Structures are given as C-alpha cells and as structure tokens.
Amino acid sequence: QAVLKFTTEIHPSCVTRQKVIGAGEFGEVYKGMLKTEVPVAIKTLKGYTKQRVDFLGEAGIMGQFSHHNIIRLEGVISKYKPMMIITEYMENGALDKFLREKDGEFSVLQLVGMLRGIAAGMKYLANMNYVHRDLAARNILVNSNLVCKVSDFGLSRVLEDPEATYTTSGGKIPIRWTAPEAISYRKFTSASDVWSFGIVMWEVMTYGERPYWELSNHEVMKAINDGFRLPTPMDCPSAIYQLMMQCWQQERARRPKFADIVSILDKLI
C-alpha cells in the first residue's frame, strides 16, 4: 500500500540490462529486456541509504496511471540488489535533448502534435487529482513514433476542490518552470502545472532553448513579477503563442484548464 499497488514485483532473473542510457539522481538508467520478451528502461538505485523510500514511491505513484501519454510501469524489484524500476522503453529519450538534436527537422504542426499528447497526459493527471510540480521538457519522454509521454513523478502530490491546493513546506523546485504564486506563496495547483505547460510549449517551439536563456533564477523571478513574459519563438503561429500567454496569466484562475488546452491544440492541427 505504501506503495504495493499497482506495483507488480519482478524477479531479477526476468531482467537483462544491456547498456547505460542515462544517469538519474538515484543511479544509472539502463536499456534492457524483460520477460514474462520486451524492451524496457530500468532505473537503479546506487550505498544509497530513505533515498530508497523516495525511489520506490515514484513507482507507486506511476503504477496508479494507465494512459497513452503517461509512462507505463512494468514493475519493480524491491527484494534484491540493486533496486530497480522497470518502465516502457522510449527510443528518443528526453524531449529537450531530442529537439536540440533534431532542430529544424520538425514542422510546426508536428511540434503541436507533441504538445497535444503532453496536454492529454496532463489532463488525465489532473482528473486523477494529481499535481505534477515538475513539468519540463526534460521530463517528457519520446518514443520512436514521436509520441510524447509525461514521466517524472517524484514531486507529484494528491489534491483536494474549489481551491484544490498543495501548500509545500519547501524542497528543491525547477524555478524557471514554476508559477509565480507557487514560488512566492508555495501554493501548487493544476493551474500552476498549466503555467509549467506554457514553458514546455516554449521549449518545444524553440527546439530546446533554455527558458530565460542565461538569466539567473534571481533575475527570472524579478522579471516574471515585473510582467516580463517569454517572447514569441521564431516561426511560431500567433495562436500558439497566444495560448502560451494564457498559460502565463499572473492570476491562476485566468489560465486555461488542461481540457481546454487539448481542444485548442486539436483545432490548430
């Protein structure tokens, strides 16, 4: 229950690591095979220490989801060493790195498609009363058919509903991606995730530019509360930038919902 559902336990003899594909905060990430024979991603723990309870907690959150645009959990290994979380394998890896690798190789219309998938995943998340709190292109994964899936559930929290708010006591947060009210007043809502989705749209339409460039976190914060918003990316359709700006309304209640975002994006496609 904390969190043994829907966490299918997997036996180590079913898992075959073949190569390192990345390093998380928790350990290496591998590409491998799973048998019950399918390709998977395998997340390991390192002398790790309670860094373990957090590690497996992410999987516990992830296992409650079943959606096209949310990363699928195959299962965990929690009895043996090293500990492992097994998910569906995504060929093209993280979305920001992938767009930088392939700049100018996608049409505006294909990019909007990628965003519609993310928006669809987030809409599902919000209907499950979750707020993600860490929505960024680095946390969207891309499969070999360019389908984008939301992936990184460490910072996620259950909500509740007029003001379904998570008030944090603190922690590390991705400053450039976070709504002003969540930085300043610690209030996180699906509307603050909508702010984050705006920044993700910008990252996508710029082919992986770092939001706010080389401004420091401290300058970004003063700017954002001085009414600064990020400029239109080159060749960005007005309608898409107008949507970004809606996501970046200073007042959270003036921001669109994820359900609205999906409709607007479908229309433009």
Curated annotation (Swiss-Prot):
<feature type="binding site">
    <location>
        <begin position="21"/>
        <end position="29"/>
    </location>
    <ligand>
        <name>ATP</name>
    </ligand>
</feature>
<comment type="subunit">
    <text>Homodimer. Interacts with SLA. Interacts (phosphorylated form) with VAV2, VAV3 and PI3-kinase p85 subunit (PIK3R1, PIK3R2 or PIK3R3); critical for the EFNA1-induced activation of RAC1 which stimulates cell migration. Interacts with INPPL1; regulates activated EPHA2 endocytosis and degradation. Interacts (inactivated form) with PTK2/FAK1 and interacts (EFNA1 ligand-activated form) with PTPN11; regulates integrin-mediated adhesion. Interacts with ARHGEF16, DOCK4 and ELMO2; mediates ligand-independent activation of RAC1 which stimulates cell migration.</text>
</comment>
<comment type="function">
    <text>(Microbial infection) Acts as a receptor for hepatitis C virus (HCV) in hepatocytes and facilitates its cell entry. Mediates HCV entry by promoting the formation of the CD81-CLDN1 receptor complexes that are essential for HCV entry and by enhancing membrane fusion of cells expressing HCV envelope glycoproteins.</text>
</comment>
<protein>
    <recommendedName>
        <fullName>Ephrin type-A receptor 2</fullName>
    </recommendedName>
</protein>
<feature type="modified residue" description="Phosphothreonine">
    <location>
        <position position="44"/>
    </location>
</feature>
<feature type="modified residue" description="Phosphoserine">
    <location>
        <position position="263"/>
    </location>
</feature>
<feature type="topological domain" description="Cytoplasmic">
    <location>
        <begin position="1"/>
        <end position="269"/>
    </location>
</feature>
<feature type="modified residue" description="Phosphotyrosine; by autocatalysis">
    <location>
        <position position="130"/>
    </location>
</feature>
<comment type="function">
    <text>Receptor tyrosine kinase which binds promiscuously membrane-bound ephrin-A family ligands residing on adjacent cells, leading to contact-dependent bidirectional signaling into neighboring cells. The signaling pathway downstream of the receptor is referred to as forward signaling while the signaling pathway downstream of the ephrin ligand is referred to as reverse signaling. Activated by the ligand ephrin-A1/EFNA1 regulates migration, integrin-mediated adhesion, proliferation and differentiation of cells.</text>
</comment>
<feature type="active site" description="Proton acceptor">
    <location>
        <position position="134"/>
    </location>
</feature>
<feature type="region of interest" description="Mediates interaction with ARHGEF16 and ELMO2">
    <location>
        <begin position="8"/>
        <end position="269"/>
    </location>
</feature>
<comment type="subunit">
    <text>(Microbial infection) Interacts with human herpes virus 8/HHV-8 glycoprotein L/gL and glycoprotein H/gH heterodimer; this interaction triggers EPHA2 phosphorylation and endocytosis, allowing virus entry.</text>
</comment>
<feature type="modified residue" description="Phosphotyrosine">
    <location>
        <position position="30"/>
    </location>
</feature>
<feature type="binding site">
    <location>
        <position position="43"/>
    </location>
    <ligand>
        <name>ATP</name>
    </ligand>
</feature>
<comment type="similarity">
    <text>Belongs to the protein kinase superfamily. Tyr protein kinase family. Ephrin receptor subfamily.</text>
</comment>
<feature type="modified residue" description="Phosphotyrosine">
    <location>
        <position position="166"/>
    </location>
</feature>
<feature type="domain" description="Protein kinase">
    <location>
        <begin position="15"/>
        <end position="269"/>
    </location>
</feature>
